[PDB]
Amino acid sequence: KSFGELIYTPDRAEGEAISKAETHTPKIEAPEKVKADQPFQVRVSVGPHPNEAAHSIRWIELYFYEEGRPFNPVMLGRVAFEPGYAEPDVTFTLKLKKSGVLYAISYCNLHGLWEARKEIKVE
Amino acid sequence: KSFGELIYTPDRAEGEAISKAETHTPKIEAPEKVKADQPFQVRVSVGPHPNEAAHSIRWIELYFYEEGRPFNPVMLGRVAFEPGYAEPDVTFTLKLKKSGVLYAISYCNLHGLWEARKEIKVE
Amino acid sequence: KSFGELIYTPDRAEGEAISKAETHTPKIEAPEKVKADQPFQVRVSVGPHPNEAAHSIRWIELYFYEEGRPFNPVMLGRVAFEPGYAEPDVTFTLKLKKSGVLYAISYCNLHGLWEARKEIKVE
Amino acid sequence: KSFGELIYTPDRAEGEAISKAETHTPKIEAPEKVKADQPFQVRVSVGPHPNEAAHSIRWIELYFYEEGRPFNPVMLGRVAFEPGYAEPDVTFTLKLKKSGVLYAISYCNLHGLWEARKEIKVE
Ligand SMILES: [Fe+3]
Ligand SMILES: [Fe+3]
Ligand SMILES: [Fe+3]
Ligand SMILES: [Fe+3]
């Protein structure tokens, strides 16, 4: 198996048995359209999910596929959360110059890597 | 010199020459009082400051001194920002059980480590 | 595109034009066979590749697919390197209980995410 | 209290009661003298110390005070370890241009931040 194959895509996440008990797939909130170079908020959150030393969303990575860039993706940010203190809920502020796709990857110490994605238009 | 001594405290930050050109000391926004186990937002931001490959706030660490805990501090979260895409501005969601002090530490690739602190009461 | 698809697999890495100029695919050095619970070294390195503020291997993530684990992978470690000071070369010390596959993912600020993988037998 | 004051210095570490049970102060192995721009290894390790989900050295940060640099320190690298899989033992490869002081900061989820320091001469 390739590393990429191991990641739970949002289409496959829906049919997982664990998903009946808890949610790992990130929710990405962001404007569908933004102006170039103008700051906007992106909120990423995972839940409901346990948040304890033995089981929690340890971190979230935010990436961006920039349309037309010769190589992709760009990592935009990464946030790590202390189990039992910080909820897996973060807001970033970004500025973009070109349209593309935002990817949020969450990591659970028990349940692996889960992906969310969201198109964003820059005009 | 100890490592701790190298960090720019908010009282010393005020008199630094670089501070006339740009701000490194984090701003922490958080309720003065919260209820135990109830989620609340903490916003940490640094600015105005350059945000480019050659010079940016690379990351922010959020720590907590918990009054009465036998050892301190607890790291609550850490966020890294891609230069030129992500602004050094983050919102966390926390739950606390005991009163203490929030510390935000920012890192600039040119200008080092800068500290902000803020008391928080849990009742 | 899924996030997983974006990652440069070691089979695809070979035919990339950029690979004629520089190497992004991690080299993983690790024993083929180890004893359960006994510490061993894993060395991960990327090169030759530029190492400057404007272009460097920013970090490496080490993951493990554990055969028989209900969910995968487990993140084993992550290391970030200061451009121009630290070379993208790290040695970890691990203990494993079960056989599986080590994955090393490198990130270049210009050229994206590149994967290496290596089987490890635990007896 | 300032954030810097909270960090356990190597002189204070010696007299801590917890230090009779386990070691948090990093050991830094590095040449006393190196040539400018020539790669060398720095090994940082913490132990003996528990390594489990509930209690482990979560990460190590490596910093450098560069003599003559207008601001300090520079972060050289940071490594995070999965509890129960990775031992808190890392080797970095560095290149330096100027003399200074290496600082290693370890973090324990129960016992806080502990400092080690080591002079390095560049000739
Ligand atoms: Fe989970
Ligand atoms: Fe600065
Ligand atoms: Fe590259
Ligand atoms: Fe400890």
3-state secondary structure of D104: strand
Report the C-alpha gap between B94 and A81 in whole angstroms.
10
Give ∠ CA A84-A87-A89 in degrees, rounded to 5. 165
Q: Which of B20, B71, B76, B77 is nearest to B49 (CA)?
A: B20
Enumerate the β-bridge partners of residue B112. B108
Tokens of C123: 């007896």
How many residues does the structure list for chain D? 123
Structure-solving method = X-ray
State the DSSP code for C8: B
CA distances from D52 to A42, B31, D55, D84 (A): 34, 34, 5, 5
Domain boundaries, chain A: 1-123
Give ∠ CA A79-B6-D80 in degrees, rounded to 5. 30
Tokens of A73: 């993706």
Report the C-alpha gap between C35 and C98 in whole angstroms.
9
3-state secondary structure of A91: strand
Q: What is the resolution of this structure in A?
A: 1.8
For residue B54, give how far its alpha carbon lies from the nearest alpha carbon of chain D (Å). Answer: 14
CATH, domain range D1-123: 2.60.40.730
Please give the full DSSP string across A28-73, using - where no structure is assigned.
EE--SEE-TT--EEEEEE--S---BTTB-EEEEEEEEEETT-SS--
Please give the full DSSP string across chain B, using - where no structure is assigned.
--HHHHSB-HHHHTT-GGGGT---SPEEE--SEE-TT--EEEEEE--S---BTTB-EEEEEEEEEETT-SS--EEEEEEEE-TTTEEEEEEEEE--SS-EEEEEEEEETTTEEEEEEEEEEE-
Which ligand has the minimum distance to the alpha carbon of residue D21?
4
Report the C-alpha gap between D72 and D78 in whole angstroms.
17
Residue B73 · residue B65 · CB < 8 Å: yes
For testing contact with chain B, the best of A41, A44, A64, A81 (most B CBs within 10 A): A81
Ligand 4 centroid from CA A35, angstroms: 48
Beta strands B27-29; C40-45: pairing state: unpaired
H/E element, D62: strand D57-66
For residue A43, give how far its alpha carbon lies from the nearest alpha carbon of chain C (Å). Answer: 19
Residue D88 · residue D98 · CB < 8 Å: no
A-D CB pairs within 8 A amount to: 7
Report the C-alpha gap between C17 and D10 in whole angstroms.
50
Tokens of C115: 């994967």
Give ∠ CA D19-D22-D28 in degrees, rounded to 5. 85
Range list of β-strands (E), chain C: 27-29, 33-34, 40-45, 57-66, 74-81, 86-94, 100-108, 112-122
Enumerate the β-bridge partners of residue A120. A100
Tokens of B100: 């203490």
Tokens of D99: 């003399």
Residue whose structure tokens are 């922490």: B28
H/E element, D63: strand D57-66
3-state secondary structure of C6: helix
3-state secondary structure of A88: strand
Residue A41 · residue A21 · CB < 8 Å: no
Beta strands D33-34; C57-66: pairing state: unpaired
Residue C71 has a CB neighbour count (10 Å cut-off) of 17
CA distances from B111 to A76, B8, B58, C16, D80 (A): 22, 10, 11, 38, 24
Which ligand has the minimum distance to the alpha carbon of residue B54?
2
